[PDB]
């Protein structure tokens with residue numbers, strides 16, 4: 001009934017990013033949000049700690065005009081309260097390590113929509129920031145697109161949330177923080193629904 | 209009860225590759241297997257067409273010694289009956305386009321274990337061979353590692369299969385074809401058990 005029991009010791013952390021393009025290596029990271037999860041005594045999954053950052057483009061980063069036009073982010077706006085990739089990831093990693101120890105997990109696994117995209121950006125930024133002891137698994141992810149495909153027959157984030165009976169505000173779709181929260185609620189609903197229907201734990205199906 | 213209804217028109221195709229390294233851009237593709245799926249009249253998911261190929265390293269490809277030591281593949285063995293990336297992929301795409309039309313789907317989505325690895329290798333090979341009208345979604349995947357995490361609380365392919373009550377022969381784990389077949393049966397069991405427990409169709413839960 002514990003978080004550490006659910007995903008063979010993986011500590012699920014919901015992540016979303018906004019970027020200045022499609023290339024994790026060369027394009028700027030502009031926003032990152034992180035939501036750790038927790039289980040109550042009965043084994044139900046829910047959001048724990050929420051973090052969010054506007055991120056300053058790393059020195060030398062490319063900025064694709066089309067990307068900025070898509071997400072509407074203006075990196076030059078001095079009122080956007082941006083912090084360095086180091087500061088943002090250091091805080092996230094700190095909170096994540098604490099949660100891993102507190103819960104008895106071995107490692108964090110990124111939960112994200114079309115996870116590889118977000119994974120690649122977060123890892124690249126960690127690299128650039130020279131962050132030590134990255135708590136995240138270097139290639140494993142929990143893709144909510146795939147999960148929503150199974151659970152809800154939909155792979156588009158907004159449609160998946162709607163089908164799950166969730167609200168989804170289109171005007172907030174370009175906010176890493178907003179997407180991370182919706183994605184976290186979506187993921188939790190999927191996991192919890194599975195349990196509720198007697199899919200977990202494995203013994204339940206025989207009423208045990 | 210139609211396959212085209214299950215994943216918003218996505219035609220799921222199970223794929224596994226064997227490679228000569230971790231870099232999809234620079235390292236050789238050595239094996240690839242493909243298994244299309246079908247749904248019967250009652251909406252149960254099962255393997256359809258099975259393809260498998262030994263693949264000749266592309267001209268200029270790197271071969272990591274450690275990788276060849278891992279998978280046991282000798283690209284220089286003339287008796288391995290290899291074919292070009294073009295031949296293999298052109299054949300897979302042909303079958304995939306055929307299944308998509310027959311079933312009324314829009315697009316193929318790759319099903320694979322830790323899917324982005326396989327996805328990136330297949331896509332790079334597709335580009336190298338200059339194949340037109342790649343039927344696969346350019347970034348969406350159904351990662352069975354994540355799905356097994358949800359359904360079975362296991363992310364390792366071999367363990368996930370065993371937990372699902374499937375046999376898994378370790379001596380065969382380095383064959384793309386073997387892995388693809390086990391992954392296909394795993395994916396089907398996961399989708400099907402979801403259905404049987406009343407998780408799908410969405411309407412089912414209120415009919416008890």
Ligand SMILES: [Co+2]
Pocket residue numbers: 287288289
């Ligand atoms: Co051979």
Ligand SMILES: [Mg+2]
Pocket residue numbers: 016017018179
């Ligand atoms: Mg996003």
Ligand SMILES: [Mg+2]
Pocket residue numbers: 224225387
């Ligand atoms: Mg493999």
